[PDB]
Design a binder for these strands. Structure first.
Lengths: 152, 375, 368, 255
DNA sequence: GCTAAGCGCACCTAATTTCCTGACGGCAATCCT
RNA sequence: GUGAACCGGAUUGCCGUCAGGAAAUUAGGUGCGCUUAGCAG
């Protein structure tokens, strides 16, 4: 969904109105799982439960409609098991369920070497500094989870 | 100066107006269902009335060629007249024009003379016909009702220019709403076969719809605009106003009147002169519920009187007083007893009321405006 | 200081506003269909009202050349007027231009009729166009116009032309559910024929509804648009009140003579604008006792009472006047005896409003 | 601690926010197209208000080139389906001419909706840039509350005088920022026995009661017109019928 | 302080599809060349 | 405070103004609520 945003900036003076168009995802829900050493995860959850600053969903005008810490941390061996363990809650009795479930997972380097194939997509979302602004590329691979095939 | 005619009239069970399905026309005024008589129907009833016969002259027809042939006599030229009209901007379907033309009946002779000559060509004849038609607005009914005429530009001669064809309407008529909850009734009829035969049944079985209601009718006549439309003919304007009052009082819509002879005269007429149009329809936002100790017409007249008093005391208290005349047949239903001063005069005769209105307008006797006749 | 005018008006079966298809204008408010009378329709009806004859001093036309040529008995200067208008920034008999009438007449007569150059004549006429805002009509409705920079000559410079409107008019929404109705008509043929049928067959559309009308006049902005002539602003406010009270939209009035006057006018003075449209989110359903207008006035009074007991500031209490013809329809009919200045006369209401704005009498404007 | 303000405002047929084509700003939610007023529109409506004009002024409340303004506002999500409408208009020439009709004869776009407005202002950072002026911070919080209550976007307001005030404002002091937009995932359908505002407030009350049952919050409605739960149970901390006492209660709870 | 029962009918026949209008007006922005 | 901090598509506008669903009609035919009684030592 697209939003037309106009900026008057500062209003010696002249008619300078910035032109902008923002893209928004309407009626979408995402689940983000981060894997790390247990103490850091516990501290991250504790600080999330007590947010010292106004958190949003990418832009200040996008507040969270559901609690970020609604799902509590737990011990799960693999990301697929964690994703399949949580049940899906239907909004009402008869609604079109998503037969295709896109997913994003970190590409495991394993041992030394094992270069990513040409079919692995690139993503520039790792910030280290903003002067000059540079984001290190990352590799993202896509997987499938389907309900009704592993649970009777 | 505006002439405002407010009328309270009760009708016998009848179907004066109906839609495509045959049911009586209805409206939702004040959140409740009412009985409606369309303004076009009242306008046609007034126009096609004995009291308005003298002030006719406007003809609204798609068959202008027939009139031109009838006026021209036995000289044929019907096809050539039709083709002249066709080039003028009135396409025909089979034999009549595709659109209605409103025009004075006195200019049919001019149209026939313009068609009949052989010296004039075709573009010139079409231009002359258009000029004659656009300038024929002298009829009083055209002055009261108005006219719009948009000729077919695509199917028109290039060298034919139309002048102004619209005349302002000097008469405003509101739809006749009922003063109470209008309940409709279904009449179950049967058609009988005179021949016995062997079926021993009926020729036709059907359903008829009718309703009886007390109607409030509102008329508005612009005196200055009526005078202007007739080009300063003040006597003709006074005659038009008087005959319009007499017609609106004395004729009813001719809808299903052979089976529903609803020929009831108005039970109260209020004539008011003011510079702005005021409608007393809000007097009947509450539907009138008939009580045992009174009458439906009396209750409607009382509610109208209360609303008229409220409007006079809350909207028309200035240096210019509003003069109004109240008419009831032999003073049968007066206005509200609580005031007894709302109307300037309480006339008990329709002719006397017409004379009073004519005198107040500019000073006019009924005899000297009826005396303008051609013979 | 804002002059807020809330009117409850019930209309007879009529079509006072329609779209291209001929159906009466409608809108959705509260999830239900509501009859609608457009704001610009009421603005124009007040504009061309008989009560604005003394204050109609602005003209909105595109054939300004015809207007200029009209003020010349024999001085035929019309092609030059069109050329100067075209070089001013209009391109064809042009786009709509809003400004005063006598000002443009006199100034065009003294400028473009004089034998002189062209580009500076365009500059002078542009300055006259921009500076002709001494009209109460423009002061109320406001205006803006920017000519295209392509056709306009670079030697012509435009001063500030945006006139901020001092009047805000809301769309008249019905207080109840909308019931559109079809009036099926015929067009009788006067000459009898072999078919006995009408010359035309069609379907008219109409609706009867109780409308809630909202007006808002900014006194400070109206004075600013008229400069120091504050008496003119008071006259404009009074004439606008009278016109809104006594003038109706000129729709299909020849066929639907719906000339009903409002049954209640609430004139309130506050520094912030309040719309009582939310009083009628729930559509008004008529019941056996009372009527549609009475129920609408009751709902409006309830909402006004909740607003006063809600958003209330002791520093600047809000005063108001209630008008009903001869006290026919009270506001607090059952318990709300809060308004101590109920009026039963429109002229008395105008006098009270004028007195509250300042030392203004309705006859005091008869001095110029 | 966090101050979260939820408003239920029903607007008369108007065009408050516009895109390039003139259509009202729209959004999609719950499988239903929904009307929208942008967050920046509401923020600018808050600014340039004469109610407040009559540290460094104009700097602490909004930054200017960091400042990291503490007030956040969500997009105004309507509770129901968006219903855009066509306003066919013409501009008359009001002179006798050879033709008729003179204006652009356009088609204006407008819609009316009951919007759910979410405002979240954090007290800690607003204190942080106020140099610990707790009294001044509370004063500016109250001023912003008053403005957001009694201000509207300055959209196409001269032809659409939409100055309706909210019928319900709910202030909570929960630790995490939770928006109640999901309360209206099912679009509100108006029934014959209820109205749009009452049904929207009821849906908000149902969402508030749910999840938690399986912090405290101040509920304000003008003169208690729309009660958020008609029971004597512990459901709402205080039912406030006047705006000024609501601001006072918020102020002495914060300080 | 309070008696009950039996009994309640069928329907043939339900009219007439192009009588339906035309015209005029519909950006102004070019928001780092 | 990470394509994110600063962030209004702002204004002008009546479709106005032409209009009879009308000329056809009997729901016409059948009929017992009817058998029982002291408001009184």
């Amino acid at each position: 969904w697209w939003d037309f945003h106009t900026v008057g900036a500062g209003q010696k003076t002249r008619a300078e109105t910035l032109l902008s168009r923002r893209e928004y995802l309407a009626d979408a829900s995402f689940l983000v799982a981060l894997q790390g050493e247990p103490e850091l995860v516990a501290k991250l959850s504790a600080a999330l439960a007590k947010p010292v600053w106004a958190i949003y969903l990418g832009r200040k005008s996008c507040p969270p409609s559901r609690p970020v810490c609604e799902h509590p941390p737990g011990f799960y061996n693999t990301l697929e098991e964690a994703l399949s363990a949580v049940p899906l809650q239907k909004r009402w009795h008869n609604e079109p369920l998503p037969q295709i479930l896109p997913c994003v997972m970190d590409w495991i380097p394993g041992y030394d070497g094992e270069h990513a194939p040409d079919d692995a997509e690139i993503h520039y979302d790792l910030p280290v500094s903003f002067q000059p602004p540079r984001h290190l590329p990352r590799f993202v691979i896509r997987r499938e989870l389907v309900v009704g095939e592993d649970v009777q | 100066m505006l002439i405002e005619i407010h009328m309270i009239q009760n009708h016998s069970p009848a179907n004066l107006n109906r839609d495509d399905l045959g049911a009586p026309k209805t409206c939702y005024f004040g959140g409740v269902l009412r009985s409606r008589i369309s303004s076009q129907c009242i306008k046609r009833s007034i126009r096609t009335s004995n009291d308005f016969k003298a002030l006719l002259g406007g003809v609204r027809t798609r068959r202008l060629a027939d009139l031109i042939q009838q006026e021209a006599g036995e000289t044929e030229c019907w096809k050539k007249a039709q083709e002249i009209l066709n080039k003028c901007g009135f396409k025909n379907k089979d034999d009549n024009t595709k659109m209605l033309v409103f025009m004075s009946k006195d200019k049919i002779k001019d149209l026939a003379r313009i068609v009949l000559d052989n010296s004039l060509g075709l573009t010139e004849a079409a231009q002359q016909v258009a000029n004659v038609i656009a300038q024929a607005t002298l009829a009083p009914d055209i002055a009261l009702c108005g006219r719009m005429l948009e000729p077919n530009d695509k199917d028109k001669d290039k060298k034919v220019k139309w002048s102004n064809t619209t005349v302002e309407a000097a008469l405003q008529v509101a739809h006749a709403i009922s003063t109470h909850i209008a309940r409709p009734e279904i009449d179950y009829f049967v058609a009988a076969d005179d021949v016995p035969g062997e079926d021993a049944g009926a020729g036709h079985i059907g359903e008829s719809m009718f309703a009886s209601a007390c109607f409030y009718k509102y008329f508005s006549i612009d005196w200055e605009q009526l005078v202007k439309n007739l080009k300063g003919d003040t006597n003709l304007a006074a005659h038009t106003v008087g005959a319009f009052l007499l017609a609106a009082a004395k004729t009813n819509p001719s809808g299903k009147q052979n089976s529903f002879a609803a020929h009831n005269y108005p039970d109260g007429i209020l004539v008011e002169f003011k510079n702005s149009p005021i409608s007393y329809a809000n007097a009947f936002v509450r539907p009138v519920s008939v009580v045992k100790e009174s009458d439906l017409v009396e209750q409607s007249i009382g509610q109208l009187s209360n609303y008229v008093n409220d409007i006079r005391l809350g909207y028309y208290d200035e240096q210019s007083p509003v003069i109004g005349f109240w008419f009831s047949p032999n003073n049968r239903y007066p206005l509200g007893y609580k005031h007894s001063k709302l109307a300037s005069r309480n006339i008990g005769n329709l002719n006397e009321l017409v004379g009073a209105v004519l005198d107040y307008i500019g000073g006019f006797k009924w005899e000297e405006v009826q005396k303008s006749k051609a013979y």
